[PDB]
Structure formats: C-alpha cells, structure tokens
C-alpha cells in the first residue's frame, strides 16, 4: 500500500517539517488523495501544513515527530511570526483532542497548550499524539 518503503511516519502523525528557507513547522501526513496531485515518490511523505493548509511532498528523512516538541520547537519564530503562532495552535489542538487533555483570546488560549507541549505532553507523552 502507500507510504510502504521502510521509513518512518504514516498517514494521520503530527510532524514538524524542514522546508528549505523556513523554521521546522508543523503538519500533519496525508495521503496523496487528499491532495489532488500525485503520488510521493518513494521515501517521501505529503504533509499538510497547519495554519496555511498547504501540501508539500516532503522527504521522510526532513520529518520529526511533532512529539519532540521542545527540540525543534523555534521560541524566535514564535515570536516574529503570526502565522507560526497560528500554526502552533491548531497543531496543538489537534494534539490535545487525540491525547485526551483538557485547559481550562489568541496568545491566551496557547498558552498552556504551549506549556503542555513544552513539557512533554504530559500525562500521556508522545503516545498520545497518534492517530485513530
Ligand atoms: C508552511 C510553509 C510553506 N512551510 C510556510 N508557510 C508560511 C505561511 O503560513
């Protein structure tokens, strides 16, 4: 089937992606059906990007697991661009829904998903980021 050449990430995980020219950003693998184009060349993913809803075929070797958060996370980034933070939001909402968490404006509303992820995704660590 698809996406069936010995590397790593499947349809549904959260990535951060490494496009050339920008910061590691978030998305999330697609099936190539999602994208009207066609199929990845092999070892390559499509990704959605958050925040733009754009698709890239990007190769599996320039994704990290969203779930190594802290690591490619871009704090500078974050605070020059809108649509990074933006991102970041509905990147992490998309988390909190599958890992079952809960919080009690914008930057507001971020910032305890951001102190989450930051954190480790806690209680239930990168696991709880999977699909299904
Ligand atoms: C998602 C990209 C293409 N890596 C950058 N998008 C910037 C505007 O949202």
């Known amino acids: 089937s698809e996406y069936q050449d010995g590397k790593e990430f499947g349809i549904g995980d959260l990535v951060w992606g490494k496009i050339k020219g920008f ?15 066609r199929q990845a060349m092999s070892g390559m993913r499509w990704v959605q990007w958050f925040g733009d809803g ?3 075929e990007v190769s599996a070797d320039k994704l990290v697991a969203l779930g190594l958060f802290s690591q490619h996370f871009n704090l500078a980034t974050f605070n020059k661009l809108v649509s990074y933070r933006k991102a970041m939001y509905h990147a992490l909402e998309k988390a909190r829904v599958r890992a079952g968490k809960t919080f ?3 930057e507001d509303q971020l910032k305890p998903m951001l102190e989450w992820a930051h954190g480790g ?3 239930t660590g990168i696991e709880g980021l999977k699909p299904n």
């Not at 910061?23 to 184009?37: G, I």
């Open 121 to 123: 995704f806690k209680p």
């Open 23 to 37: 910061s590691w950003w978030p998305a999330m693998v697609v099936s190539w059906k999602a994208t009207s184009k």
């Open 104 to 106: 009690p404006s914008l």
């Open 54 to 56: 754009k698709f890239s």
